[PDB]
Scaffold this motif. Structure first.
Motif, PDB file in Angstrom:
ATOM      1  N   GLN A 162       0.810  -1.217   0.000  1.00 58.37           N
ATOM      2  CA  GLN A 162       0.000   0.000   0.000  1.00 58.37           C
ATOM      3  C   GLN A 162       0.844   1.268   0.000  1.00 58.37           C
ATOM      4  O   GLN A 162       0.342   2.360   0.291  1.00 58.37           O
ATOM      5  CB  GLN A 162      -0.998  -0.008   1.158  1.00 58.37           C
TER       6      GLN A 162
ATOM      7  N   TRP B 169       1.642   3.622  -2.156  1.00 60.61           N
ATOM      8  CA  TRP B 169       1.091   3.975  -3.456  1.00 60.61           C
ATOM      9  C   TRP B 169       2.121   4.627  -4.379  1.00 60.61           C
ATOM     10  O   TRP B 169       2.042   4.486  -5.605  1.00 60.61           O
ATOM     11  CB  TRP B 169      -0.122   4.901  -3.281  1.00 60.61           C
TER      12      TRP B 169
ATOM     13  N   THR C 166      -3.790   7.324   2.721  1.00 59.35           N
ATOM     14  CA  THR C 166      -2.521   7.907   2.256  1.00 59.35           C
ATOM     15  C   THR C 166      -1.321   7.311   2.994  1.00 59.35           C
ATOM     16  O   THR C 166      -0.313   6.928   2.377  1.00 59.35           O
ATOM     17  CB  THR C 166      -2.478   9.444   2.443  1.00 59.35           C
TER      18      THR C 166
ATOM     19  N   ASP D 114       4.561  10.028   1.693  1.00 54.12           N
ATOM     20  CA  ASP D 114       3.265   9.479   1.286  1.00 54.12           C
ATOM     21  C   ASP D 114       2.374  10.562   0.685  1.00 54.12           C
ATOM     22  O   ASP D 114       1.470  10.268  -0.115  1.00 54.12           O
ATOM     23  CB  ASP D 114       2.513   8.867   2.474  1.00 54.12           C
TER      24      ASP D 114
ATOM     25  N   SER E 183      -5.636   7.494  -4.230  1.00 54.55           N
ATOM     26  CA  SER E 183      -4.660   7.279  -3.170  1.00 54.55           C
ATOM     27  C   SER E 183      -4.686   8.348  -2.076  1.00 54.55           C
ATOM     28  O   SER E 183      -3.935   8.249  -1.103  1.00 54.55           O
ATOM     29  CB  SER E 183      -3.247   7.169  -3.752  1.00 54.55           C
TER      30      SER E 183
END
Ligand code: 16M
Ligand code: 16M
Ligand code: 16M
Ligand code: FES
Ligand code: FES
Ligand code: FES
Ligand code: FE
Ligand code: FE
Ligand code: FE
Lengths: 192, 446, 446, 446, 192, 192
Positions: free
Chosen positions: A104, A106, B212, B361, C102
């Motif tokens: 995860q 991303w 996120t 992130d 996301s």
């Protein structure tokens, strides 16, 4: 080097020079080159677990600093000269590795592309710990992602390497004083 | 674009035109109506504690020198020579009684005064009016418990009034804890995002955290970790959101004193904050003592953000509509043991600094949301901030400001953008006030 | 600049102001009057053949997701989240039933619908109107024999009508050959040229070939090779030029089925195309069967170009007035042996791809011609496209469109720029039509 | 901005708005009112001495080809093809009878004429009017003792009149010395400064030398070396400053014939210049012979600068408001021994070339002063040039122009900016003249 | 390397690693360094015929690919993953060389300037063809032209080299997976 | 190399190639690598006096040229083909060193940061002066200053080195033909 005469040289830099100018062992420079080339290959293919297992000692300090810009003639202001972009022990590197490998994360899709260029390798044994190897090298690190994002990092690395498990030489200290004060690479999320 | 008439932010702050993150003309307009008008973060007492100490800071796109005076006050000046406009100071911090220009050698005092001009007698005689040639001074410089802010506009409200209802929430950590220190130097990184993208995120975005930051939550072993990948929703009563007249706002996550810090700091922090909370109960009451050790994600309008307890302190310095220079400091409580302060500072940078894995992130989210604001088919599209609308209150008996009594929502987006629109459409502070006389009513409609 | 009145293209398309390749205000105006109004190339059936398959594509400066639906149709959507505007998809191709953002985890279907919102019940309750929060959809998506085009303007002519007289020329290769496939992924390279520089070159520039590509002609051993260094002029009747109402046009070089391909492919290609031509004679007649195996250099207005037989397929994606992102695919005939398709695809990239040695010959020409359009003394200068003027015909008994019955000329420049000017000076399709009611008469004057 | 009304330069040139170094709209306006209107440096006879010799040069942002004709004259043309606008010449210097375009092969003569068009007969027939398709020619090209200047505006004063009172000062070195040669090729480096920053510095800035160049003065062992770190002021009568109607001006430092050259050239130069001065006394009188061997820091308006005796020759080629391409040549006296010329040329580059250690001292000063002109709080601030105001004279019996009889001052800034403002607010030469009819009175007020 | 654990590593990359980690021959690394340095010198001075004659085997495959950006989790979409920027046999390289040397290659006037930086050299003999040498190296390639055009390329090169005529080791395969998806260098018209 | 066949190769470049292709001495290449790595280290830490003392011969010519762009087919225009960005003897290098070390060199505060990457090292003894060592190497030089100024230089270096005082090998000639005609690095104020 006399730093009273060579006015621009820091005491730390003069000490590090002295280390390599003395005993020169060609075989050691070659071993060091191999060690660093293999490390860079593992990192470039994003084999971060393999990097930890094969290249990184359990007692590691992995440190990258950013130094505040101060006057060359400054001699009164004494507060913290630098911050730590990285200052990681082994467990902290492992956290960062798990973050890279997490499905995860991303930002890692599509897969990033890394290319590292290692140059200027110098190596010398410590004079007092005969099992401690000092290695200096410079890195250009190219990171490409997302079609048109391209970030290039430049740094000198002061390393200490020591034989660990299976007699494999592993990184026990890396120190980088990052040369650009304001990063123009979106972040410093790469292993220098 | 006519900024008097153009609806960039809809009624109640429910939506904003996406062009606001991309339009360069609006960015230029913001330099006037946002950055030249409002209070901006400069430095902390702890970074310039002694007479002669100075730092440089950005205020919008301008650079200023911020100097501790002999009388203990702080004054700030444009980092620009009054002769032919060269940048006076090229370092980030130091100690000096004055600054000499490297072009023609004019010497300015730490007080901004033109003190010396090379060969003045031979060249200018008595004709140079040095009294009128002091560095251009920042009109207003005020402190909030050691945190120093500046404002170019003499007409601005005092900093305390400007913080409005947000001050009540910040005080337990900023004042009643015994005081904070800023640990420098800051990390500095350029991102390809509009300054409003991280500002809005820090002011009111708890929604994004689980998704996120899924990888950072899972990997980094912090207390907020149950949230990874939206695996779990914070329970009812886990926190709240607030906003204020002049745009500042924050989220409160109850009890989250260890914040984003990894498990290696969790027991120590939770012990320290709990111990101080027990003392503060008797001084400021149970609620406010609890707020002290609760995680606040806050933006001080327009572009200063922080996470209390995590200890993250941010300036989103504007460069252009899609470029922002991010400054990251650590905040620590003065009475923490020095070794804890050092480890806390490193952990702030580890998580949110230049190589901050949490902050990483957020990169793509903020950069692409900003850059899409330039794309033809998205300019006139509506960014949504309606979550929780119709459930906010004002004038609550315990929690002041416009408040949403839930941990996740967009209450603070609405107040941030309400203030933003009122400034962009106003020519001065008086007009902002007129445009804001029913601010809380607008935010709590329905 | 007043685009209603400013003559950017002179009567009959005889000249254009050089500023058109350099002016950033005009580039912004083109986003509205050219790219948001006209049909733009997206993808081919062969790249998204199965339900769930998707690619990303540019339409002007916007990015879209182009997705095969369960019912076999194709729909396209802005690659922008409806919440706070983050870029939804960060890859170039794949297969999915939906796309999750996301930032806050909103989930959109392959059909663009907002299908899921994390913790919707707890956060929004019943108040989020998801039916109104679907991705912004491209209004028109149509196919020309597998080649998929999109248009943001609901009022556009159908794609077939938009191709106008150019369709007749494309059909032998696009339809009657049994069909084409697009071989991906494309090469992608940024050049410092205006998108119109390569577009105009592909639409109608046979004149440049012998001189610009002298070294590639001499070295690369192709069939068009006699032309190297202007050593020889193609004989009379070697080809023709055409253009059409909506701007598309092409050159036809009779029989040139092996195109720019090196001698290693010439015998095989010339055998293959000749064999199919012999079959097509009986189906579509000798002329059209000959057109099938004739080299067409074509631009589908505004920014999609191709060389049939050579198999080069281009998108000139606009970035700014002097920046273009070049996408290069190969086209192959479906019924070619697979090994030939593979070698043809490699040869397309070898000649016209990112390291295409032919395409490299064009770099300086297109970059400097574009950049000179910004230079003060050249802005108001006239780019000439008068070659062959006064010898074009319309309504010919055999070859449709505005036609110059010679292989080398500027007929297709004139039609391209006539359409361009009519769009730039019009607010909508109705106005373009009014401005185009005597289009062929204007082009054949004198 | 309304350039007819906006006061960018105050009365008597006493101050300028800092925005002039940063504003891109003003930069675009300068392309018209400064660069397209005034005389700009192209080349020297010594670089194109033979028929067919050519160089490329910038004139503002435009590029021109500058060619020696068969009749011995020089003509200059836009480096842009008359067909579709490709850059004709891609090299910096050479010898040719013509230039062929690499796009479609059009051939232009050294005289700018369109001489050949590939396959003209077959393609254009008799319809191409080549007589009307010559390269766009620079209207005015004139020489000042071998130094070749160009002007796009037919209405400009002759170059000699344009030099005005500055010509008298340049003549001893440019004419009476027997003549100068320009030694090429130039160094070429881009700096992040406005072109006006180095132009103003060379025209009139002696004040900066001791402080800016302290390290070069101390290290480089030249004659001006007493000045290092403002250790000493030049004595009374050490020099003067002048300025003129059309903006050109200079400082004169008496006797400084060895200039910035290091001690290794000082004795040789001081011997050479003194010997020639002794001969010139009898020809042009003692004062002018002394001027010959005196150091002149001069700007020929707008963007050509030089240091005579030091032999530095500069073009500040404008790119945008904060970008300038610096061209650096060496000037030498023709009758110097060849070995001295070679060492002088190397020394010019050593001190002021791409790695010129003196020139490096100026980088930060000029870049930051220029970039600060974009900063919000500095745009409307005033750059000061009042040093020496009220002590300038005009019509002196010995020294012509507006003259300050002191080595250090801002006389030449005032005349430079007076001319600049008169051009920026004028639509043509007639208006400049009207705006300049009391030019010297304005400069000598008080 | 276990690619089930090291999630970001491709099977191909893991195989290439294994090749160099095993038998390490210092002399071979030095030979490889010489071979590549001499090759880069010939290319930098644009001695393209000499490069073909001295460095390139008759059976060469010279390949540079550009890989389409796909999801890290993608497991259904199966179409062509990459295109060939280069995929040349010897005769095709010769065509490109003749194109460079042609006096009507207008883009080559004024003469281009090339500077190549070769680093991270690793070498290993093939385990099954004892005359096949695997060489890996990274390149930074700087190309400057026309006053102010500057393009810098970055790549990792997987080579196979074999002794040909006169016993001279020559390139029989080069494979580059170019790390930037969208080129920002005007073209890829350089020999990596 | 036949430059009549290899049309793009200059006579000078063909001569320099010939020097290294003949006698290859591995030990010499290693010595040369050490010499250049140590030189680059001294320069990177701004030990300019140490560089002069340890690396630079009294008879040095230190030269960097910029060549005017001319047509590939040009054979008539004969004027000066290049200018000297540097053309320094020892005393002239000393002037530049003193300029760097001067406390009133305002541009050196805050302190600059240099990182050099030396690659492609080749070495060969002169055939006629057996004490003259030819060394070729390429440099990437990264200079960072003032927060966000970053300049990267790229060059090939043709050196001659000779044993001087104490038998220490020192630079007696460096020649660089700088590959970018218009500098985009603010200046060339770095020692390549
Ligand atoms: C940043 C907005 S909310 C938040 C909460 C915890 C950590 C980081 C951020
Ligand atoms: C590109 C315009 S014409 C043409 C013909 C053949 C090959 C390439 C181009
Ligand atoms: C450049 C303005 S004044 C001056 C005088 C001497 C050398 C250099 C400059
Ligand atoms: S610009 Fe500062 S003293 Fe002149
Ligand atoms: S921006 Fe996409 S879910 Fe919020
Ligand atoms: S652009 Fe020059 S001949 Fe066509
Ligand atoms: Fe976040
Ligand atoms: Fe072409
Ligand atoms: Fe100066």
């Amino acid at each position: 080097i006399n730093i009273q005469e060579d006015k621009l040289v820091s005491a730390h830099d003069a000490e590090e020079i002295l280390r390599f100018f003395n005993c020169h062992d060609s075989a050691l420079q070659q071993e060091a080159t191999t060690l660093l080339t293999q490390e860079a290959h593992l990192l470039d293919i994003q084999a971060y677990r393999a990097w930890l297992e094969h290249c990184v000692g359990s007692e590691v300090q992995y440190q990258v600093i950013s130094r505040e810009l101060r006057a060359a003639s400054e001699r009164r202001y004494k507060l913290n000269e630098a911050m730590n972009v990285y200052n990681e022990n082994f467990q902290q590197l492992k956290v960062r590795v798990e973050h890279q490998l997490d499905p995860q994360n991303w930002g890692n899709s599509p897969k990033l592309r890394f290319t590292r260029f290692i140059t200027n390798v110098q190596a010398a044994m410590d004079v007092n710990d005969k099992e401690l190897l000092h290695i200096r090298s410079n890195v250009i690190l190219h990171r490409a992602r997302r079609g048109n994002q391209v970030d290039v990092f430049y740094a000198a690395r002061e390393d200490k390497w020591k034989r660990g498990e299976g007699g494999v030489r592993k990184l026990v200290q890396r120190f980088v004083d990052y040369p650009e004060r304001i990063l123009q690479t979106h972040n410093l999320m790469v292993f220098l | 674009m006519n900024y008097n008439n153009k609806i960039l932010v809809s009624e109640s702050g429910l939506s904003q035109k996406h062009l606001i993150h991309g339009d360069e003309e609006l960015f230029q307009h913001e330099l006037k109506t946002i950055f030249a008008r409002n209070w901006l973060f400069l430095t902390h007492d702890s970074l310039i504690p002694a007479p002669g100490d100075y730092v440089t800071a950005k205020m919008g796109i301008d650079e200023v020198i911020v100097s501790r005076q002999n009388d203990g006050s702080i004054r700030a000046f444009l980092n620009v020579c009054r002769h032919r406009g060269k940048t006076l100071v090229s370092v980030e911090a130091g100690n000096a009684k004055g600054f000499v220009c490297s072009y023609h050698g004019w010497g300015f005092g730490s007080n901004g005064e033109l003190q010396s001009v090379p060969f003045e007698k031979d060249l200018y005689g008595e004709s140079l009016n040095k009294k009128c040639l002091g560095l251009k001074e920042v009109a207003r410089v005020e402190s909030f418990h050691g945190f120093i802010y500046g404002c170019f506009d003499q007409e601005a409200p005092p900093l305390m009034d400007y913080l409005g209802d947000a001050a009540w929430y910040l005080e337990p950590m900023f004042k009643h804890s015994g005081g904070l220190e800023l640990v420098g130097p800051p990390g500095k990184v350029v991102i390809k995002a509009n300054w409003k993208a991280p500002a809005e995120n820090f002011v009111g975005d708890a929604y994004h955290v689980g998704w996120t930051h899924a990888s950072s939550l899972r990997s980094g072993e912090s207390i907020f970790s149950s949230l990874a990948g939206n695996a779990a929703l914070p329970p009812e009563g886990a926190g709240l959101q607030m906003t204020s007249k002049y745009g500042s706002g924050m989220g409160v996550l109850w009890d989250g004193y260890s914040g984003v810090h990894s498990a290696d700091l969790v027991p120590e922090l939770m012990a320290f904050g709990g111990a101080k909370q027990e003392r503060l109960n008797k001084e400021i009451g149970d609620v406010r003592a609890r707020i002290y050790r609760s995680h606040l994600n806050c933006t001080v309008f327009p572009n200063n953000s922080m996470l209390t307890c995590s200890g993250v302190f941010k300036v989103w310095n504007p460069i252009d509509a899609n470029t922002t220079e991010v400054w990251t400091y650590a905040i620590v409580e003065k009475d923490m043991p020095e070794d804890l302060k050092r480890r806390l500072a490193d952990s702030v940078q580890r998580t949110f600094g230049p190589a901050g894995f949490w902050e990483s992130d957020d990169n793509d989210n903020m950069e692409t949301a900003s850059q899409n604001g330039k794309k033809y088919q998205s300019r006139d599209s509506d960014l949504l901030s309606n979550l929780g609308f119709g459930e906010d209150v004002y004038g609550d008996a315990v929690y002041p400001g416009v408040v949403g009594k839930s941990a996740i929502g967009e209450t603070s987006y609405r107040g941030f953008y309400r203030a933003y629109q009122a400034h962009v459409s106003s020519s001065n502070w008086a007009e902002f006030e007129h445009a804001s006389s029913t601010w809380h009513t607008e935010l709590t409609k329905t």
